[PDB]
């Protein structure tokens, strides 16, 4: 009884800071809130065909949905009022969990895209830096107790 995978599932359309843009801009997220009413009274229909917002002078390549205005509200919503910003680009915190506790502690999981070559250098023969570092003695314990 838990549904914790990452901090990015409920990030774009279910985060608690994202619903403040759903209430202040009076535009509901498709599934998130329960259609809370507007804060102010003036909703729309301020001008039919203004010289700035004319329908003919707009290249509508793709429609601006309600999910677009909730993400970046200042670039899309004309005259906002008390819009709380959302948190952007939660990092890839994905973790390869262990399937069974028979594998050891640190193990190369099969659901990992491996390194293909890993043989870019040409060191089949011993390098001349090894003979140069042959006069570098060492007799102490390593950096941690193994």
């Amino acid at each position: 009884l838990l549904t914790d995978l990452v901090d990015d599932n409920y990030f774009y359309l279910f985060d608690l800071k994202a619903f403040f843009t759903s209430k202040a801009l009076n535009m509901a997220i498709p599934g998130g809130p329960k259609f809370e009413p507007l804060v102010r009274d003036i909703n729309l229909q301020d001008e039919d065909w203004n010289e700035f917002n004319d329908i003919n002078k707009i290249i509508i390549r793709q429609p601006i949905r309600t999910e677009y205005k909730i993400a970046f509200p200042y670039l899309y919503n004309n005259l906002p009022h008390h819009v709380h910003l959302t948190w952007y680009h939660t990092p890839n915190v994905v973790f390869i969990k262990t399937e069974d506790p028979d594998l050891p502690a640190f193990y190369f999981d099969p659901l990992i895209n491996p390194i293909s070559h890993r043989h870019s250098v040409k060191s089949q023969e011993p390098l001349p830096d090894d003979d140069e570092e042959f006069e570098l003695p060492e007799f102490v314990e390593p950096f941690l107790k193994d």
Binding site: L85, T86, W87, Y88, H89
Partner: protein
């Protein structure tokens, strides 16, 4: 911020939330991407130092 905590004795590190001191703008703390570079001058010692 890790270089500031190593230089300054201002222990306000990542106990619960992050300690991003370079992002000074309020929009940089809310959005979390940062929209302004900030120059930082501190005294970072070398190995001799």
């Amino acid at each position: 911020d890790c270089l500031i905590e190593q230089t300054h004795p201002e222990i306000r590190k990542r106990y619960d939330q992050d300690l991003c001191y370079t992002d000074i703008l309020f929009t940089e703390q809310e959005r979390g991407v940062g929209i302004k570079s900030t120059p930082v001058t501190v005294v970072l010692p070398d190995t001799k130092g």
